């Protein structure tokens, strides 16, 4: 496939600048940072808990594994 006839679009406008005429790091710390935390809280409760659960079964299985090998 190629550009030109991929689909049909109408009454849509795009504006853009030349990269030599704008900063590459605008508000990199000023605005980017809370977006990350926003991007973080939006998803973290869905990523964390199985890995949180992993760390526990890792230790509990590890300790119980140790205790099994010790003695009466």
């Amino acid at each position: 496939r190629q550009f030109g006839h991929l689909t049909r679009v109408r009454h849509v406008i795009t504006y853009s600048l030349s990269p030599f005429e704008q900063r590459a790091f605008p508000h990199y710390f000023s605005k980017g940072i809370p977006n990350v935390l926003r991007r973080t809280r939006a998803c973290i409760l869905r990523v964390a808990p199985p890995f949180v659960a992993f760390y526990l079964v890792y230790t509990w299985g590890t300790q119980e594994f140790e205790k099994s090998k010790r003695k009466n």
Binding site: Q2, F3, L6, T7, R46, P50, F51, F54, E64, F65
Partner: protein, 370 residues
């Protein structure tokens, strides 16, 4: 007029929103080409015979001008070559690219074609874990009725792993990557009929962009970071993912304490050690891989991505934990706490894929009045 084909690298329509997760497709194109150059220069000084192989690596790592870096850019150049896959696959499952059946079923055929090649490649240094790795793992085919005693001896070229087993791996090893390179160009070919997917799962014909200034430099970045994490291991922790017993030459009359494959197989191995029945263990092993070919026939949500499927997100990242578990159990020995865990995780792997994740999208459809 080749360079009409370079339009797949220059003027190619591609979406605009795709984040780092897609770079891992290209990086394999770097690791593979990288690994071929390194392993080649290892061939110049390797010997495929048992009385000379283990030393041959020493000739490289000791006497050769910078022979040693090449071994570790190449061994660990396989480890990183599987971090890339497992994330390159998880994309395809989480963002729902498996609807490109023609590619996915070939994505599988690349995986197997590889994940046997490392097995062969791990033998060639001819140490304990090399030998004993291949000794255990070939015998699993012996479990098959009426064939296995014949097929295994055939693969070995004898009645146990020995010279002719080694020499043929070196030839099956130093060839398939040139077959893998073909299937990649095939794999892309069916992709460049459809164009890649985005995090949303939505048709991106409207907001396409070229590929020459934008993703190129993005791949140059993503490639650069890859060369970091490779060379760090080469230059700061080369024995990390290794296994030191490998640095003892093969002794078929002295079994090591811990037999195991390397880290990138272990989740498969844990599934096997879970089941006591030998043959039934095998069909679980091969099915842990081939199950990818059952995913699209288990697609149920009328959406594609998982950015917009909350329940499947929670189940997906649970699957990752089950994998990481199986990676851990396989590396660890077999005792009553770890046996129990290895059983549960393996059941989750098949259960979670076949039952819950389909069941989720069905439920998710119902909430959306579908």
């Amino acid at each position: 007029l080749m360079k009409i084909v370079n339009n797949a690298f220059i003027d190619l329509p591609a979406p605009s929103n795709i984040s780092s997760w897609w770079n891992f497709g290209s990086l394999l194109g770097i690791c593979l080409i990288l690994q071929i150059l390194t392993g080649l220069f290892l061939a110049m000084h390797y010997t495929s015979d048992t009385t000379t192989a283990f030393s041959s690596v020493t000739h490289i790592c000791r006497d050769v001008n910078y022979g040693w870096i090449i071994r570790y850019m190449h061994a660990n150049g396989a480890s990183m070559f599987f971090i890339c896959l497992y994330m390159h696959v998880g994309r395809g499952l989480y963002y729902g690219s498996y609807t490109f059946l023609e590619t996915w079923n070939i994505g599988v055929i690349l995986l197997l074609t590889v994940m046997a090649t490392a097995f062969m490649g791990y033998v060639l240094p001819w140490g304990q874990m090399s030998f004993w790795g291949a000794t255990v793992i070939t015998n699993l085919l012996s479990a098959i009725p009426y064939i296995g005693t014949n097929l295994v001896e055939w693969i070995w070229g004898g009645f146990s792993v020995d010279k002719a087993t080694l020499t043929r791996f070196f030839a099956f090893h130093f060839i398939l990557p040139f077959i893998i390179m073909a299937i990649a160009m095939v794999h892309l070919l069916f992709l460049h009929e459809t164009g890649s997917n985005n995090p949303t799962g939505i048709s991106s014909d409207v907001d396409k962009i070229p590929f020459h200034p934008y993703y190129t430099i993005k791949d140059i970045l993503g490639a650069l970071l890859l060369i970091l994490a490779l060379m760090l291991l080469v230059l700061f922790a080369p024995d990390l993912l290794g296994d030191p017993d490998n640095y003892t030459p093969a002794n078929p009359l002295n079994t090591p304490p811990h037999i195991k494959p390397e880290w990138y197989f272990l989740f498969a191995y844990a599934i096997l050690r879970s089941i006591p029945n030998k043959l039934g263990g095998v069909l679980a092993l091969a099915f842990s891989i081939l199950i990818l070919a059952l995913i699209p026939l288990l697609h149920t949500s009328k959406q594609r991505s998982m950015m917009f499927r909350p329940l499947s997100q929670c189940l997906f990242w649970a699957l990752v934990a089950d994998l990481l578990t199986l990676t851990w159990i396989g590396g660890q020995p077999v005792e009553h706490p770890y046996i129990t865990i290895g059983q549960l995780a393996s059941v989750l792997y098949f259960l979670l894929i076949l039952v819950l994740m389909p069941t989720a999208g069905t439920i998710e459809n119902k909430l959306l009045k579908w």
